[PDB]
Design an enzyme around this catalytic site. Structure first.
Site, mmCIF file in Angstrom:
data_model
loop_
_atom_site.group_PDB
_atom_site.id
_atom_site.type_symbol
_atom_site.label_atom_id
_atom_site.label_comp_id
_atom_site.label_asym_id
_atom_site.label_seq_id
_atom_site.Cartn_x
_atom_site.Cartn_y
_atom_site.Cartn_z
ATOM 1 N N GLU A 11 0.758 -1.208 0.000
ATOM 2 C CA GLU A 11 0.000 0.000 0.000
ATOM 3 C C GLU A 11 0.796 1.268 0.000
ATOM 4 O OE1 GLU A 11 -3.119 0.162 -0.496
ATOM 5 O OE2 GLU A 11 -3.846 -1.798 -0.052
ATOM 6 N N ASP A 20 -6.375 6.678 -4.819
ATOM 7 C CA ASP A 20 -5.837 5.362 -4.956
ATOM 8 C C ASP A 20 -5.865 4.923 -6.438
ATOM 9 O OD1 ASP A 20 -8.426 4.517 -5.418
ATOM 10 O OD2 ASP A 20 -8.537 3.245 -3.746
ATOM 11 N N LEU A 32 -8.886 4.057 2.917
ATOM 12 C CA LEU A 32 -9.841 4.697 2.053
ATOM 13 C C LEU A 32 -10.632 5.761 2.815
ATOM 14 C CD1 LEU A 32 -11.756 4.855 -0.374
ATOM 15 C CD2 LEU A 32 -12.941 2.983 0.374
ATOM 16 N N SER A 117 -12.541 -19.760 -6.138
ATOM 17 C CA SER A 117 -11.210 -19.825 -5.621
ATOM 18 C C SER A 117 -11.152 -20.227 -4.160
ATOM 19 C CB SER A 117 -10.613 -18.443 -5.609
ATOM 20 O OG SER A 117 -10.610 -17.886 -6.921
#
Ligand SMILES: [Cl-]
Ligand SMILES: [Cl-]
EC number: 3.2.1.17
Length: 164
Positions: A11, A20, A32, A117
């Site tokens: 980050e 971002d 955020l 997944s």
């Protein structure tokens, strides 16, 4: 290496408000502030988050504090989510870190949606899950980061992070 160090690498750290990868106002270590297009709105969330009139700048210690809170909240979010918790409880410690990275970036909801997944990770079919994770907007929009996390799930080591 650990989750904190891992996300600090993915980050970065910025002390003034910035946009971002998706053009949303953020600050600190991936914190955020809002999805609204408005800088004032962001400035106001920032003040509310720091507990003071910040004028759009925070110190390092405040960035680290928002970071600690965000990691804690990502972990707690996983433990409370019916589709994530079982996966998280099935994995070893390095791979747990890779799932928390994903939840930190994309939100619990977001992740809980990678149904196929998650199932493969749960079954421990590593290569398969790696291939499946790759077929996603996430991978096409932030491929370098996505590759680091995917290799993390595939190998169960921190090799994609050693160097950085
Ligand atoms: Cl907050
Ligand atoms: Cl990237």
């Amino acid at each position: 290496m650990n989750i904190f160090e891992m996300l600090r690498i993915d980050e970065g750290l910025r002390l003034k408000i910035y946009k971002d990868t998706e053009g949303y106002y953020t600050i600190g270590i991936g914190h955020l502030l809002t999805k609204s297009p408005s800088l004032n709105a962001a400035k106001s969330e920032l003040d509310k988050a720091a507990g003071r009139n910040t004028n759009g700048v925070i110190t390092k210690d405040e960035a680290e504090k928002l970071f600690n809170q965000d990691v804690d909240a990502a972990v707690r979010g996983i433990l409370r989510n019916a589709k994530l918790k079982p996966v998280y409880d099935s994995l070893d410690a390095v791979r747990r870190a890779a799932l928390i990275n994903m939840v930190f970036q994309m939100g619990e909801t977001g992740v809980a949606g990678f149904t196929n997944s998650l199932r493969m990770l749960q079954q421990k079919r590593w290569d398969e899950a790696a291939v499946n994770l790759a077929k996603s907007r996430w991978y096409n929009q932030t491929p370098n980061r996505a590759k680091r996390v995917i290799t993390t799930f595939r190998t169960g080591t921190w090799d994609a992070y050693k160097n950085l």
